[PDB]
Amino acid sequence: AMYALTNCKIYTGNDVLVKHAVIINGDKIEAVCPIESLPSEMNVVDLNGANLSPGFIDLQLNGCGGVMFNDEITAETIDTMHKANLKSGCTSFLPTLITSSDENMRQAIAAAREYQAKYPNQSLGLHLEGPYLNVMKKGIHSVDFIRPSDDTMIDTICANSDVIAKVTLAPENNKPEHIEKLVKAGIVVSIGHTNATYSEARKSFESGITFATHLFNAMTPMVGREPGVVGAIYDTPEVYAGIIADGFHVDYANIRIAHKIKGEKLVLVTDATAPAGAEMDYFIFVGKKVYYRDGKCVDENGTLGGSALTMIEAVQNTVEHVGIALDEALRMATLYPAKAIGVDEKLGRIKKGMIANLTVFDRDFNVKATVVNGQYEQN
Amino acid sequence: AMYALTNCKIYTGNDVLVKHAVIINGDKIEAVCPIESLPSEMNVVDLNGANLSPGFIDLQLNGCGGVMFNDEITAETIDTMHKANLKSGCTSFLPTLITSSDENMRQAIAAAREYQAKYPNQSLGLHLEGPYLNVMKKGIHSVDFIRPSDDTMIDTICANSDVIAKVTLAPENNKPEHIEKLVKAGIVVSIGHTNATYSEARKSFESGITFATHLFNAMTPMVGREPGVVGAIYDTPEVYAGIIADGFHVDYANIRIAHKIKGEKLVLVTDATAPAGAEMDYFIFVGKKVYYRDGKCVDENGTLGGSALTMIEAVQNTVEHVGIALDEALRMATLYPAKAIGVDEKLGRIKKGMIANLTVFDRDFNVKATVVNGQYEQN
Ligand SMILES: O=P(O)(O)OC[C@H]1O[C@@](O)(CO)[C@@H](O)[C@@H]1O
Ligand code: NI
Ligand code: NI
Secondary structure, X not given: OOEEEEEEEEEOOOOEEOOEEEEEEOOEEEEEEEHHHOOOOOEEEEEEEEEEEEOEEEEEEOEEOOEEOOOOOOHHHHHHHHHHHHHOOEEEEEEEEEOOOHHHHHHHHHHHHHHHHHOOOOEOOEEEEOOOOOHHHOOOOOOXXXXXXXXHHHHHHHHOOOOEXXXXXXXXXXXXXXXXXXXXXXXXXXXXXXXXXXXXXXXXXXXXXXXXXXXXXXXOOOEOOEOHHHHHHHHOOOOEEEEEOOOOOOOHHHHHHHHHHHHHHEEEEOOEOOOOOOOOOEEEOOOOEEEEEOOEEEOOOOOEOXXXXXXXXXXXXXXXXXXXXXXXXXXXXXXXXXXXXXXXXXXXXXXXXXXXXXXXXXXOOOEEEEEEOOEEEEO | OOEEEEEEEEEOOOXXXXXXXXXXXXXXXXXXXXXXXXXXXXXXXXXXXXXEEEOEEEEEEOEEOOEEOOXXXXXXXXXXXXXXXXXHXXXXXXXXXXOOOHHHHHHHHHHHHHHHHHXXXXXXXXXXXXXXXXXXXXXXXXXXXXXXXXHHHHHHHHHOXXXXXXXXXXXXXXXXXXXXXXXXXXXXXXEOOXXXXXXXXXXXXXXXXXXXXXXXXXXXXXXXXXXXXXXXXXXXOXXXXXXXXXXXXXXXXXXXXXXXXXXXXXXXXXXXXXXXXXXXXEEEEOOEEEEEEOOEEEEOOOOEOOEOOOHHHHHHHHHHHHOOOXXXXXXXXXXXXXXXXXXXXXXXXXXXXXXXXXXXXXXXXXXXXXXXXXXXXXX
């Protein structure tokens, strides 16, 4: 049957709504209408004054709730991740596989294909972060697998674009043609783990790169005579940029500045790993031990190795520490990520016709429930 | 006698006027009015379709037209600079003394007093760049003279505020009380040649710093976990930043980014040395000799050695390479600097009752003439 979510503040993406309701029908949003407009017969889930927004979309998520995608490359891993996400309001995500072997890349593609043939609008496709990086900005990435982009695997990726949302790579020393082919196959291409100058990064935007992976991390910073990759991102309006707001990856003052420059091009990601939503001392990250240490994820050397952030926390830290308004924070965690991967016509807003993927959260930012394809599940 | 500047495009700082004129009476702008409104028997100077604008205010000038100020610390040197300034549209400036001995600072104070006693609104005050810097970002400043700030010299600096417009220091390891004292005396305090964290930089703005000296040069830059000084300037509305637009000190894409962030607060400065508006092939400066190679300043290694920029060129570079509009660029050379040192009541604008300091330049940015306290003099 149809039902209506009721008694809540609703953040549609365009308007903050009081004394209205949202009518769900199947997998879809039927209507957002005033509460007095609601049919007498209609079933009601009453949300006790909490916030309602579209479900969060996480564009960079390596693992969570105890598991890692790189380590157990299966549909069931993706499945486990999806369910842990729900605890922190995240309804969609790109399962992210960092630098590894060709065989691992073929396994992930299969796994994505498997999971998505069963469930829609949850995993929105692979994010291949690596392996075509620059060894100098490797962070946690494996020195054994970082390699130049090659024609064969690039062709494989293109051929499987129906399960592949995004590729992060370093363009300085890789073939421009490979960018073009990926873009031509409808995969989103992102600069990251790159030692490019401002010029080279500009060149790769002209080639089709439209995204930047974790602004400020594993990229040439802005200095007086070399704007670098950071400057290029600040100077190119078409480029989205993901940014991690755990308080450890990037100083909040920088997130604030970035938002004033980037506005709707700034996107909240987690880059989260197995400890996000799980209690653990360390995890494996492609034969690397990564340790959980007072909220951070670090290797033996203190290099950060993803995060333990969740999407709800990223919204909150952004409101509370960065100084950004709530409705805008939510947009950075929903609508803007959706626009960046070209799913915004079905996800990222509360409006009629679109898919019922929603999150409810109280004033203290506790996620109380989600809707996923119309299905309401309490926390 | 009254006369009118005529057959020009006028850039008042608020509006761009066609088919108007400016009336000069003595040393004041009388009125800005349609040409048709001119008393038929008034003397007119036909400017031949040139651009008319307030004279350029350079807030950082170490020397030019052949001489360095630190070399000959006299009212005579200040006057050689002024006369060279006029050739490139600059009608007011801050004679800038770099870090030296107390004795030299006393001479500098005296040379400015004597000059300003004779002429007004040309030198608008001494700028002390140093000596209270940070050795770790010393650049060309002498290690033997860079020292903490001390009550005695601070007390004398204050005692002469009538002749000192500005002091650049590094605040991170000097006394806050000292900043307070200087600001209280109506001296502008600028952060510069510093190794301050963002936190330190913010503390200094709190204590009264309202300016930053040559943004991106000799300061702590903006990296992911450490916003630095560049970051603090970006995050503080009150703080003006001077910037050198020669194409060598700071990449043009960085100036574009900074303007978008800072607007009204971004000021064009030359920071010029001897070669500016002079024919030289080198100049010795406090020991090291620096060559003048095709409009660039280099030590025998080919490393940047200082600036030869003029204000009219700064403006042209800003229009032409940064992408900023003519009127806005003009504002960055006139109104904005004027406001930063608190002289906007009299200067930086073509308006009734304000001092007649004006610059006329053609479409090719060739200065054709200026007007200083009402006196028209062709180039
Ligand atoms: O380049 P930065 O500022 O040192 O940080 C790099 C960040 O990117 C990574 O997440 C990628 O491995 C970590 O290396 C770290 O968190
Ligand atoms: Ni990474
Ligand atoms: Ni300097």
